[PDB]
Curated annotation (Swiss-Prot), chains A, B:
Tissue: Ubiquitously expressed.
Membrane topology category: Multi-pass membrane protein
Any single biological process term in GO: regulation of jasmonic acid biosynthetic process
Gene Ontology CC, one term: plant-type vacuole
Organism of this sequence: Arabidopsis thaliana (Mouse-ear cress)
Intramembrane feature ranges: 212-226, 579-593
Name under which the protein is recorded: Two pore calcium channel protein 1
Length: 647, 647
């Protein structure tokens, strides 16, 4: 067993908790596990595609209320206000499920090769994975045999997706940590609602407002909760205002105190609890990483000199360069990283000085063109003058001028968006000219900056891609002047218009203050991804629940639906019949926009007051816990960067 | 001229920028100015009452649209949806205005006595004050003569009230400072709205959504601005969703980006700018305060020894204690203040050590009963055991037990809130007993702690007041059992029930985690008062404007009003006919609850697209700038208080 291989495995496990167990490092037959692990990691993209396909299966699955026999079969996509996504027949669903299950079974049970036997079965996460996959196998086998209270496949596959990604698991652990403090603050919020509703119930006992709205304590509590959400602020206390204008003072006090005090208090408590949870998790990961790096360093130096020389550290570099989970490293980057790692400047790396490897490896991003093969062309008087022009600050001025002229052309073109394509050809030719000038611009920029220097930064690659896609689109439009179903259609023209509008957005980066804010947003989006994914999974679970319980109560032939708020407001296309319909309905409830319309209506269709436990629990878990968290991150990023400029 | 008098004036000016001018300190005839200033400050409560009466005059003034001759006179409070506040006739209005104007004229022109002549006419604040008062005098004289485009008195007296209070002036200066940054971020927000609306206009050109909602660029910009506030989130893009379910992706992107990027960015920018404004203002005030303290210290020490001996420093306090604008100081507190001021512990105060006078004076709040006059009663065997009981921790346990019994009794009372008073007398006697037990409790607490000890803290005073207030009412209810219009009325019984329920809040006072949050809420409001006052003044200005322009367009006989959103939603009692009606309508717009209903409707009644400039500006100035600032203070207070414990 080569010690450098064990050190490379330890570095992989030090970068993140995913890796080989520490209990297999010194045991015999180490390379056999290593090769199997490497082959497994070669297919991470395949595994990711499989998991995403497993999740996206739910969008196309036939709803359970179609599994029965409604009086019209649900192929009439308009009767039940469904729409726009196809349904897999039994054969398609079965073959798709079998494909996904085969890939999942290979993925789940493959670790047994490189984890030994006892280690695989002694891990809680692996036990949960195997339990989920065996439940999935039993469920699909039952489906095959039948061809049943309900199908448990959506929930189990969503759980598999959640625990297949490290970030979602971390988010769930953090939410579990927060749960206690969240329940504590929820108790105070509930006490405030209960006392305020009791006060309102007693005050408006025999008044006109107590005979239409606050009929009992339960109705008063319900309406006061809705009012706390400010979804019906003027509506709820119109009778009180009409009977006595002084009654509005109490409701103004309630709304103001509730909204500002309670809402901001809940947000602050959630942010504090999540910050403490992050502190604990990050401390745990940091200690694990430090311990793993210490073990690796102790393993490497078998001479016990205390420091690592040049050749040994280089050898470690090409031993660990084989992993795909670590950043790519070049040849001279080996020496560059070794030089950067040295802090005491002694051509050697200390035990504590080596504890900064993970940060150091992905830190260079620097350093030469292929245009210097022929020096008779690159070094010329006209070439030199053009090279002087390209870095001249007036080059950006000229580009901005061309962009403004393009802006004028696009605005005048959109002005005549009603007239037919008879007079559109001169403008199309002009935009062809503009696109080809932009192509000349990018080609000249490549011809100046070189190839690799042009490819180092990512924004330049994005500009590269957008320029090519827009120019190939405009060429496809131009070189085919005859009518065709792929070039004379208005959709292609609209796409071309949007392409020019994005190219005109490019202009907005001229203003430094706006460019800073756009850069802050763009940098923020990757860091907000795990929480958005957790919200997406929660919406998936709630959509499964809503299709299960509120399945087909909204129809075109229902009688008691047309007396509800949903039909009167014309939201009947926002329902829980489909999976996509649930995806959009939970988005509409996700913003508190007329959110009580659904809760009022489905409570009527279901016929029980228990159904609101679905929506209330949705509001309490999603809006008060997750969205508050997202808003907290957005505010924190903006506040930190804002303080960063003046600091 | 006594130097100690000049030092006292300088210390008064060092506490806050309000005081005598610095240019009269060395001039002859100081006591004449000092006595006039002292007499003036003796009437600060009268001045405050006068200013508040001037501000509250607007609530009762007859609306201008009544000064004309409508077909029915506006004494019909039901025809124009007015109500509940009386109108002053011409004589009452004239006499009230003359009284207020005379008092304010005395207040404004009095500083001429103690400030010389040139100094009074060389201050910008005095110049604007005299301009406001002369404009008010001209306006009231014109009103008297007439017995006219519009009445300028409301705005003028609102500005007089605004600049009569130092905190409102400071808030206006800070808003003027923020105006530039707020305008920049508003420009960015407007660019976002403009381009998003253009993209939506060209996307949905010939679609069903472009033929009903996005008819033109102006209508699209209007609807997208409304959608930015999520006031009509599902409503606006129903046609797009019904024609193509994929069109919802664009609107989901727009709404999410708006709500979670732009709104929070505006909030962060406003908070950062305002925090910088506080930094500048507080730095200026602190430097001015230190300069004034240095001048005072240089003035007092005429021996130039560099430190003040004890007796002279004590003598300074008898001179400076005559001002009503400085905290009260007791005779024996002089030595304690002198001891606390001394940091180097040398029985003397240094030049730099004198910088902490304003902080030190209002800092002691410590240091004894009158019950010890007879020692034969207080020092008794039973009295000693009672003293042991009262400080025992089980005393609070017994109090809580009594409170829980009171809870059970009052809940059972409220259950039988429908039955009349025959069975209500046993419960009335029960609450008679409970209130008198609480009276025994508070009197016993006085007897064990003393009188001044019972009076030092303010919460004890509040408990004192509420105990007497509730017990006098409960005893007046019982001692007069016959029917009366002041004791047998149901309103009095309801007041008694609310008083008891408010008393039961003490139970929540026990839970430490809830106690901290309630304490933070109580402590925050004193610090939030100037901003709420600024918002109140802005609402006053907008109410004056709305009554002026949207005066009587909402009637019971209007034809085009019943085709608007206002009448259909039954908000007609929320209008701008009155001043109180404007006070509540601006509150409903102040919270974004169905806020576009008014803006849609008055745009129809006025018949111009310019009227929305009233509401849009109201959104831009109040909600984006002021309410965001209030939310920032609430968040900051909660966050700092929460982080205090873990630190
Ligand atoms: Ca790893
Ligand atoms: Ca070594
Ligand atoms: Ca070293
Ligand atoms: Ca003063
Ligand atoms: Ca002295
Ligand atoms: Ca000293």
């Amino acid at each position: 067993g080569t010690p450098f291989q064990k050190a490379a495995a330890l570095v992989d496990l030090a970068e993140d908790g995913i890796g080989l167990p520490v209990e297999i490092l010194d045991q015999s037959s180490f390379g056999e596990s290593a090769r199997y692990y490497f082959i497994f990691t070669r297919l991470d993209l395949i595994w990711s595609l499989n998991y995403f396909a497993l999740l996206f299966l739910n969008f196309f699955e036939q709803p359970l209320w179609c599994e029965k026999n409604p009086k019209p079969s649900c192929k009439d996509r308009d009767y039940y206000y469904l729409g726009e996504l196809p349904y897999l027949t039994n054969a398609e669903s079965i073959i798709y499920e079998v494909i996904t299950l085969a890939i999942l079974l290979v993925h789940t049970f493959f670790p047994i090769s490189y984890e030994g036997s006892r280690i695989f079965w002694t891990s809680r996460l692996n036990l949960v994975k195997v339990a989920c996959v065996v439940i999935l196998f039993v469920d699909v086998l039952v489906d095959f045999l039948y061809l049943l209270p309900f199908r448990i496949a959506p929930y189990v596959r969503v759980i598999i997706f959640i625990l297949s990604i490290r970030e979602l698991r971390d988010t769930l652990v953090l939410l579990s940590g927060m749960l206690g403090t969240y329940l504590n603050i929820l108790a105070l919020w509930m006490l405030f609602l209960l006392f305020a509703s009791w006060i309102a119930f007693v005050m408006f006992e025999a008044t006109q407002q107590g005979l239409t709205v606050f009929t009992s304590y339960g109705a008063t509590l319900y309406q006061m909760f809705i009012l706390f959400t400010t979804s019906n602020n003027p509506d709820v206390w119109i009778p009180a205002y009409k009977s006595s204008r002084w009654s509005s003072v109490f409701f103004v006090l309630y709304v103001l105190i509730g909204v500002y005090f309670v809402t901001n208090l809940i947000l602050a408590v959630v942010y504090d609890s999540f910050k403490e949870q992050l502190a604990k998790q990050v401390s745990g990961m940091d200690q694990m990483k430090r311990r793993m790096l210490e073990k690796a360093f102790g393993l490497i130096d078998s001479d016990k000199n205390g420091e690592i020389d040049k050749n040994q550290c280089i050898k470690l570099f090409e031993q660990l360069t084989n992993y795909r989970t670590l950043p790519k490293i070049s040849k001279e980057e080996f020496g560059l990283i070794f030089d950067e790692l040295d802090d005491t400047r002694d051509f050697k790396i200390n035990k504590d000085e080596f504890a900064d490897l993970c940060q150091a490896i992905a830190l260079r991003f620097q350093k030469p063109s292929l245009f210097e093969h022929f020096p008779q062309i690159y070094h010329s008087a006209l070439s030199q003058q053009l090279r002087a022009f390209v870095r001249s600050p007036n080059f950006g001025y000229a580009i901005s001028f061309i962009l403004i002229i393009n802006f004028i052309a696009v605005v005048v073109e959109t002005t005549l968006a009603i007239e037919e394509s008879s007079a559109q050809k001169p403008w199309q030719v002009a935009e062809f000219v503009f696109g080809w000038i932009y192509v000349l611009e990018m080609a000249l920029k490549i011809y100046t900056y070189g190839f690799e220097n042009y490819w180092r930064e990512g924004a330049n690659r994005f500009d590269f891609l957008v320029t090519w896609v827009i120019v190939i689109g405009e060429t496809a439009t131009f070189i085919t002047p005859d009518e065709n179903t792929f070039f004379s259609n208005g959709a292609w023209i609209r796409y071309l218009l949007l392409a020019r509008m994005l190219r005109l957005i490019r202009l907005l980066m001229n203003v430094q203050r706006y460019r800073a804010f756009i850069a802050t947003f763009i940098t923020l989006i990757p860091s907000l991804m795990p929480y958005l994914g957790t919200i997406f999974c929660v919406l998936c679970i709630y959509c499964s629940i809503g299709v299960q319980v509120f399945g087909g109560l909204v129809n075109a032939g229902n009688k008691k639906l047309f007396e509800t708020e949903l039909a009167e407001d014309d939201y009947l296309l926002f329902n829980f019949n489909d999976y996509p319909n649930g995806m959009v309905t939970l988005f509409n409830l996700l913003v508190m926009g007329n959110w009580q319309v659904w809760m009022e209506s489905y409570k009527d269709l279901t016929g029980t007051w228990w159904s609101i436990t679905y929506f209330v629990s949705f509001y309490v878990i999603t809006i008060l816990l997750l969205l508050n968290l997202v808003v907290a991150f957005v505010l924190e990023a903006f506040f930190t960067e804002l303080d960063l400029e003046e600091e």
